[PDB]
């Protein structure tokens, strides 16, 4: 009855309300009945007598608590619910919900959103915090944000909550904490213009079993490979559900044409006698890709007359000369050299190019410094497809929407990402917390490591 | 040492009571065991040595010799007093042009030989960068080097630091 007339609602400061972390009591560690104190942000367990929230309320004179699961506010030590609409942004920062009208109009958001502190931001164009060595995963998670259908899947918890898990399955923590992070990143009424990905990364550390730590940085291509495969594994309900959202968004079908070269150290009569052996003929081992791996030609070891930078440079179509049915790539394993041709059959709606920068030579890992000269608003991938296929694929023109760039040495490297904000046409370089507005002409000048493209 | 150990183990139990110090203790099974277990291990060593008997850092030098051998096998054998010195000078010239960040394109050189020299220069480049950084961690850590290793290292690191600095300037441009 003293709901709607609580005195202690001025005592709330949203400057300390960090709802990004583990909802455990800060005394008893318990996830059961955790309550945020809205005066200091610290979580405490229980709303009854001799609980930690009650004893905290009388210990600190902090008399207003929010149930972290029920989203109901409470005055302790004396107890009653608080029903105030001015506290709704606290629950919306704690648990962002997205209606279907809010998801459909989510990419048509030209006006800036304001945080609770005076910091304007755009939803999704939101900095991810850097714990020690993390920017590979911040870059990949900001790349899978701003992919609209994967985002729209992970913005409704109902899209993935009811799907079946094995009993001792830790791998679904990736799915639910990725959804939590996606709802925090696209939150239009946040309390700060940045989101700590720390719970998402503890899910990454636990699920990859200390592959992709936070203290030691990994490669973004390895993390994106594992993370798309692990989201696709965990969004299958106690089975390989063959089509998840990750397959529906990123996966295409290529047609690899492996051809065994006979052996190089043979005479010519035996070398063309081995052609009819049909072990040295073409195969078709047609498979599915999450991402296309683009191999740069190596740094040319010498500068050359023509352009005078030491920085080498390839067009995008020359490293997309792989994945047409003409260009053959040498594969070399022990005793056997193959001539793999590639052929794109199903082009995904959102195509990832993982441009291979780091190769290990005989002595160390060298980063290819070659700059891919790509357009950002039109690549007609029509001619990288069979004519058996180009009648099915009506739209094959892709626009770049995300560009993860690795900067520096392979050892002391950093990751930034140019994301295209939809609704505007503006591009933003997010290096982990700072959000620069980058120009559309300056994306193609950086070392493109991972790229995500949208089929229109 | 072990047999002496067992002697100290045995004697100091043997020489108790009315038994004093002296040469009369022989409980030889412990040491005899130890020497037989040694014989177990060196039996196939001495057997392999008798079967063999009673029968019937410088990767640039090795790499340069190997690539010279790989061109010198595939020559027309009419010409090896003529071209084997010139392609060695081409190897060393391509390496000098890599160390200088200057273009090396010989127009009259045939592109398989050019591609093998390019390959040699890339292998020596990776070894050279790695041995410059390794010798620098050796020198900086405090490991004992002489004058020519430091002088050589400083030249390698000067060319590497100026390759990185030229890449830094071109990244600024």
């Amino acid at each position: 009855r003293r709901s709607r007339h609580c005195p202690y609602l001025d005592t709330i400061n949203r400057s300390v309300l960090d709802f990004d972390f583990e909802k455990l009591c800060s005394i008893s560690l318990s996830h059961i009945n955790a309550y945020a104190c809205l005066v200091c942000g610290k979580y405490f367990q229980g709303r009854g007598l001799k609980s930690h929230a009650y004893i905290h309320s009388v210990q600190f004179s902090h008399h207003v608590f929010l149930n972290l699961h029920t989203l109901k506010f409470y005055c302790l030590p004396d107890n009653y619910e608080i029903i105030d609409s001015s506290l709704e942004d606290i629950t919306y920062v704690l648990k962002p919900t997205f209606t279907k009208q809010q998801i459909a109009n989510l990419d048509k958001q030209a006006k800036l959103s304001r945080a609770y502190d005076g910091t304007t931001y755009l939803p999704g164009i939101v900095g991810l915090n850097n714990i020690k060595a993390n920017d590979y995963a911040n870059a990949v998670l900001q790349a899978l944000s701003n992919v609209p259908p994967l985002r729209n899947y992970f913005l409704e918890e109902d899209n993935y909550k009811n799907i079946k898990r094995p009993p001792g399955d830790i791998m679904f923590l990736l799915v639910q904490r990725f959804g939590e992070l996606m709802r925090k990143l696209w939150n239009p009424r946040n309390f700060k213009a940045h989101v700590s990905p720390h719970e998402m990364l503890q899910a990454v550390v636990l699920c990859s079993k200390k592959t992709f730590q936070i203290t030691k940085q990994g490669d973004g291509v390895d993390f994106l490979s594992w993370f798309l495969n692990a989201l696709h594994s965990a969004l299958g309900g106690t089975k390989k559900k063959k089509k998840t959202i990750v397959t529906d968004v990123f996966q295409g079908s290529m047609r690899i044409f492996t051809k065994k070269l006979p052996h190089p150290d043979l005479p010519a009569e035996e070398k063309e006698q081995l052609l009819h052996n049909d072990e040295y003929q073409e195969t078709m081992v047609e498979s599915t890709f999450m991402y296309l791996t683009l191999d740069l030609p190596t740094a040319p070891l010498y500068k050359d007359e023509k352009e005078q930078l030491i920085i080498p440079q390839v067009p995008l179509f020359n490293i997309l000369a792989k994945f047409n049915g003409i260009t053959e790539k040498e594969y070399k394993t022990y005793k056997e050299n193959f001539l793999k041709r590639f052929q794109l059959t199903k082009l995904p709606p959102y195509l990832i190019f993982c441009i291979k920068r780091f190769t290990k030579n005989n002595f160390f890992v060298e980063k290819n410094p070659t700059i891919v000269n790509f357009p950002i608003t039109n690549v007609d991938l029509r001619e990288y497809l069979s004519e058996e296929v180009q009648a099915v694929h009506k739209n094959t023109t892709y626009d770049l929407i995300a560009n993860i760039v690795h900067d520096g040495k392979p050892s002391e490297g950093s990751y930034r990402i140019h994301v295209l904000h939809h609704g505007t046409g503006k591009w933003y370089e997010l290096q982990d917390l700072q959000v620069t507005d980058i120009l559309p002409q300056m994306i193609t000048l950086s070392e493109a490591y991972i790229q995500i493209w949208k089929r229109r | 040492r072990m047999c002496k150990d067992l002697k100290h183990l045995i004697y100091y139990r043997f020489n108790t009571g009315p038994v004093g110090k002296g040469p009369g203790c022989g409980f030889w099974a412990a040491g005899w065991r130890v020497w037989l277990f040694f014989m177990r291990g060196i039996t196939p060593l001495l057997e392999r040595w008798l079967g063999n008997l009673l029968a019937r850092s410088h990767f640039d030098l090795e790499l340069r010799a190997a690539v010279m051998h790989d061109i010198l096998d595939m020559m027309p054998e009419g010409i090896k007093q003529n071209k084997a010195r010139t392609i060695l000078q081409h190897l060393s010239e391509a390496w000098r042009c890599w160390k200088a960040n200057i273009p090396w394109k010989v127009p009259g050189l045939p592109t398989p030989i050019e591609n093998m020299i390019l390959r040699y220069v890339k292998a020596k480049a990776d070894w050279w960068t790695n041995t410059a950084h390794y010798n620098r961690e050796r020198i900086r850590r405090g490991a004992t080097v002489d004058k020519t290793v430091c002088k050589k290292n400083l030249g390698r690191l000067t060319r590497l630091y100026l390759k990185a600095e030229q890449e830094r300037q071109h990244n600024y441009l």
């Binding site: 190089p264 150290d265 | 090795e62 790499l63 190997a66 690539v67 051998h69 790989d70 061109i71 096998d73 595939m74 020559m75 027309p76 010409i79 003529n82 071209k83 010139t86 392609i87 000078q89 081409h90 060393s92 010239e93 010989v106 009259g108 050189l109 045939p110 398989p112 030989i113 591609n115 093998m116 390959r119 040699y120 292998a123």
Partner: peptide, 30 residues
């Protein structure tokens, strides 16, 4: 690998070149 086991591909493609291009190899005096 060993060194010539890395250079074997280039040695076999070096077998391709003709003898008209062997004595026309310049020296480094230029």
């Amino acid at each position: 690998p060993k060194i010539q086991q890395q250079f074997s591909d280039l040695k076999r493609k070096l077998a391709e070149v003709t003898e008209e291009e062997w004595l026309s190899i310049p020296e480094v005096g230029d």
